[PDB]
Enzyme design. Structure first.
Site, PDB file in Angstrom:
ATOM      1  N   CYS A   1       0.791  -1.018   0.096  1.00 55.61           N
ATOM      2  CA  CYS A   1      -0.031   0.186   0.107  1.00 55.61           C
ATOM      3  C   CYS A   1       0.856   1.251  -0.042  1.00 55.61           C
ATOM      4  CB  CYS A   1      -0.916   0.136   1.156  1.00 55.61           C
ATOM      5  SG  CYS A   1      -2.230  -1.134   1.310  1.00 55.61           S
TER       6      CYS A   1
ATOM      7  N   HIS B   1      -2.044   7.678   3.535  1.00 57.12           N
ATOM      8  CA  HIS B   1      -2.645   6.486   3.086  1.00 57.12           C
ATOM      9  C   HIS B   1      -3.945   6.533   3.973  1.00 57.12           C
ATOM     10  CE1 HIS B   1      -3.630   2.579   1.745  1.00 57.12           C
ATOM     11  NE2 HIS B   1      -3.332   2.089   2.837  1.00 57.12           N
TER      12      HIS B   1
END
Lengths: 355, 279
Positions: free
Chosen positions: A140, A276
């Protein structure tokens, strides 16, 4: 007081984040969409907690996949930024799903595949005749990994222009008989980094670290569906196992503190933050752990879902596009990744072309 | 990029495949998995260099195998660098993976990142336990199974070349691909198929590509990967694992520098990186 030495000191080159774009799926799916009809144990408490109200999935029937949307985005960015294809010295791609599906006009007969990855085929499709192709994976956080790889190549004079691609076809790993399918989503991002010609933009410092204590919690595993029917076949599926408490909440701040310390800056010196986007409570915990106020960052998973490595570049682009991030700002970008990994970067930003 | 130590661990089981791209190569058996061989290879490199797992700053992995990586043979991702960090105890390391890169390209990129970030002890590992990939029975192409561990000290000074294959310069070489198995019925079935079309002149074109690239650094001795049995003694080859014996011979002879050349079957190119060695 002019010269520190009789000789001249060498200097790492400055790293310019020059341009960025994203490409999202055309179709959006609401939380009551029929694609979730077989998902058990759903509730409004579940949906509200993760902060996703709608998300996109690539529709390969309509020509959308991890490759075609990247070609579209990359060609648009190269033309808008006036970047000649042969001036790109390196192409770094990430794609978290092991399953790719399209290789354009380069390998036109190849369909679902594990290998090759994207960079070499993409460099040929785009005519990047001088680009060294590389395909990296840090789940990610791959966008931050690729910015770091690009920046180090530029700093040491080994590349003058680097094209960075993240393309997430995560939906081809989602088990829609399982609650695990309800948060991740598809999308693509492309960015251009170059050797800076002045001081207006630079990667001041970064910090990357990993911890595999909870590696088995979030995996891609060959298995049958969680709640199968008929003669279901095994597939590669995102899988969640079951403890982790403050692990992800604390480790992104650890990375941010390390990066700021290496940059010689404090949190109060930072104009804006880009995180994120796994869940509102996690972004908030990260922000509070470093001293970032809610007016210094955005939550963007609400209308896109969690786009694996693309949530960070999408959120950076949103902040630039909406005027939250301005030329001259110092920002921190930071996130977590399964594995697990953690990365943070302190940037002095100049003008960034959003295209 | 300085090589502090090399570790290698291969299965004892060899399998011969006929065909232009065939050979005798190490091949994992039963439900053997990669960590069984990767962990001892890594520990061998650490012990030689007298480096402790807690001192590892960076772990970068290369492994195509879609299963048989770790104790749970069904896990494919995240990739093997992460469970390696766990079992090794490399609690300070950063971990990532460079997917289908050649070793040479990976060493160059890692030298750049790791020197820039000030790291002192970096582990670059390559391995396969390829039971989940069907060999190419038409051409004889298969991956060698085993594990290779390079414990490195970055310098930022590694040079790099990406060069064409030799042989007929008008020959368009057909690359390796690994399509997905479209008819998986049991969790233990192959997940993909090696496809490398039968090209009789390809092994020699790779070797000629190696020799041409080495001419960019004629003052350096060099080591290379051998992916094909054609024209090799007994038809035996170890793929990138061939590098281990060559590096150790270079160490025995007290070379301080050398050129390492990889074959990239996906790009159909050769790639070289210059290295320093340890006594």
């Amino acid at each position: 007081h002019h010269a520190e030495n009789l000789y001249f000191q060498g200097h790492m080159h400055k790293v310019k984040l020059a341009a960025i774009t994203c490409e999202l799926p055309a179709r959006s799916y609401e939380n009551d969409d029929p694609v979730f009809a077989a998902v058990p144990d759903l509730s409004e408490s579940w949906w509200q907690f993760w902060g996703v109200n709608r998300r996109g999935y690539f529709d390969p029937r309509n020509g959308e996949n991890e490759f075609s949307l990247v070609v579209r985005a990359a060609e648009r960015l190269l033309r808008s930024s006036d970047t000649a294809p042969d001036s790109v010295d390196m192409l770094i791609c990430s794609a978290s799903s092991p399953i790719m599906t399209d290789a354009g006009d380069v390998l036109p007969d190849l369909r679902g595949r594990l290998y090759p990855r994207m960079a070499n085929v993409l460099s040929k499709q785009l005519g990047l005749s001088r680009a060294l192709p590389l395909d990296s994976q840090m789940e990610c956080a791959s966008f931050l990994l690729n910015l770091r790889l690009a920046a180090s190549m530029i700093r040491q004079g080994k590349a003058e222009k680097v094209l960075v691609v993240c393309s997430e076809y995560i939906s081809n790993l989602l088990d829609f008989t399982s609650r695990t399918s309800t948060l991740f989503a598809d999308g693509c991002a492309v960015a251009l980094l170059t050797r800076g010609d002045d001081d207006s933009c630079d990667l001041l410092a970064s910090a990357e670290h990993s911890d595999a204590t909870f590696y088995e919690v979030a995996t891609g595993r060959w298995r049958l569906p969680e709640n199968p029917t008929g003669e279901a076949k095994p597939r590669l599926y995102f899988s969640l196992f079951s403890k982790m408490a403050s692990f992800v909440p604390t480790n992104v701040p650890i990375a941010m503190r390390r990066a700021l310390e290496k940059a010689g800056l404090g949190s109060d010196d930072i104009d804006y933050f880009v995180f994120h986007q796994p869940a509102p409570f996690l972004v908030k915990a990260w922000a509070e752990g470093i001293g970032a106020r809610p007016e210094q960052y955005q939550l963007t998973m609400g209308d896109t879902g969690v786009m694996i490595s693309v949530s960070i570049p999408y959120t950076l682009m949103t902040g630039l596009r909406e005027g939250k991030i301005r030329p001259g700002d110092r920002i921190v970008m930071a996130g977590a990744a399964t594995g697990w990994g953690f990365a943070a970067q302190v940037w002095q930003l100049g003008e960034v072309l959003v295209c | 990029m300085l090589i502090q130590a090399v570790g290698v661990n291969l299965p004892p089981s060899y399998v011969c495949l006929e065909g232009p791209l065939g050979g005798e190569r190490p091949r994992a058996q039963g439900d053997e998995m990669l960590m069984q061989r990767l962990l001892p290879a890594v520990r061998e490199a650490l012990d030689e260099a007298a480096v402790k797992p807690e001192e590892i700053d960076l772990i970068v992995g290369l492994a195509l195998s879609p299963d048989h990586l770790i104790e749970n043979r069904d896990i494919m991702a995240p990739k093997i660098g992460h469970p390696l960090q766990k079992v090794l105890g490399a609690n300070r390391a950063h971990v990532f993976d460079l997917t289908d890169s050649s070793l040479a390209r990976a060493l160059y990129v890692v030298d750049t990142l790791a020197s820039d970030q000030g790291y002192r002890n970096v582990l670059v590992v390559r391995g396969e336990s390829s039971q989940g990939l069907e060999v190419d029975s038409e051409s004889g192409f298969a991956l060698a199974d085993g594990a290779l561990a390079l414990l490195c000290r970055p310098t930022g000074k590694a040079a790099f070349r990406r060069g064409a294959l030799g042989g007929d310069p008008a020959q368009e070489w057909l690359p390796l691909s690994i399509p997905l198995n479209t008819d998986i019925r049991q969790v233990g079935d192959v997940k993909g198929h090696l496809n490398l079309p039968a090209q009789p002149g390809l092994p020699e074109a790779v070797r000629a590509g190696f020799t041409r690239l080495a001419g960019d650094f004629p003052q350096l001795n060099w080591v290379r990967e051998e992916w094909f049995g054609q024209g090799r003694p007994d038809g035996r080859c170890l793929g990138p694992f061939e590098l281990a014996s060559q590096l150790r011979a270079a160490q025995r002879d007290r070379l301080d520098e050398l050129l390492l050349i990889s074959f990239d079957p996906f790009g159909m190119v050769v790639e070289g990186v210059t290295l320093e060695l340890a006594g």
